[PDB]
């Protein structure tokens, strides 16, 4: 269906997200480092971004729109299957980096929460 928005809200939001995405390609302290093991890094990112949506739905969904998470699938030829996981990991990571940059007070809450899994 096609709807007429005289205030162009959907389109204004798309321009904002694009300004946020661009403003980081160009141009809050954390308590731990993410796992170096790539499988564990993926699992860590899935848990953290999933918690961001539960604790901070609007902030999370802004960061995920900046990161383009909506294309990706949660965790055919193996080349493209693994590229899917890599693409998912890149977007989860960009979500976290966007939260760190624009929602620092959310990031510090999620940083203390994820520290409990780190040791
Ligand atoms: O993971 C975070 O620290 C975070 C913070 C705000 C929004 C999205 C996020 O993933």
From Swiss-Prot:
Annotated stretches, region: Salicylic acid-binding core (SBC): 9-119
Outcome recorded upon mutating residue 112 to A: Slightly increased salicylic acid (SA) binding
Disulphide bridges, residue numbers: none
Induction: Up-regulated following pathogen challenge or salicylic acid (SA) treatment, and down-regulated by methyl jasmonic acid (MeJA) treatment.
Effect on the protein of changing residue 63 to V: Reduced salicylic acid (SA) binding
Residues annotated as binding salicylate: 48
Subcellular location: Nucleus
Signal peptide residue numbers: none
Effect in UniProt of substituting residue 60 to L/R: Impaired salicylic acid (SA) binding
Disruption phenotype: Enhanced susceptibility to the virulent bacterial pathogen Pseudomonas syringe and to the fungal pathogen Erysiphe cichoracearum (powdery mildew). The double mutant npr3 npr4 accumulates NPR1 proteins (while NPR1 transcripts level is normal) due to reduced NPR1 degradation by the proteasome; this leads to a reduced growth of the compatible pathogenic bacteria Pseudomonas syringae pv. maculicola ES4326 after inoculation, but impaired hypersensitive response (HR) and subsequent systemic acquired resistance (SAR) induction when infected by the avirulent strain Psm ES4326/avrRpt2.
Subunit structure, interactors included: Forms homodimers, homotetramers and heterodimers with NPR3 in the presence of salicylic acid (SA). Interacts with TGA2, TGA3, TGA5, TGA6 and TGA7. Interacts with CUL3A, a core component of the cullin-RING ubiquitin ligases (CRL). Binds to NPR1; this interaction is disrupted by association with SA, probably due to conformational changes.
Physiological role: Salicylic acid (SA)-binding substrate-specific adapter of an E3 ubiquitin-protein ligase complex (CUL3-RBX1-BTB) which mediates the ubiquitination and subsequent proteasomal degradation of NPR1 in the absence of SA. Together with NPR3, acts as receptor of salicylic acid to monitor immunity in a NPR1-dependent manner and induce systemic acquired resistance (SAR). Involved in the regulation of basal defense responses against pathogens, and may be implicated in the cross-talk between the SA- and JA-dependent signaling pathways.
Domain comment, as recorded: The BTB/POZ domain mediates the interaction with some component of ubiquitin ligase complexes.
Family: Belongs to the plant 'ANKYRIN-BTB/POZ' family. 'NPR1-like' subfamily.
Identification of the protein by name: Regulatory protein NPR4
Gene source species: Arabidopsis thaliana
Gene name, Swiss-Prot/TrEMBL: NPR4
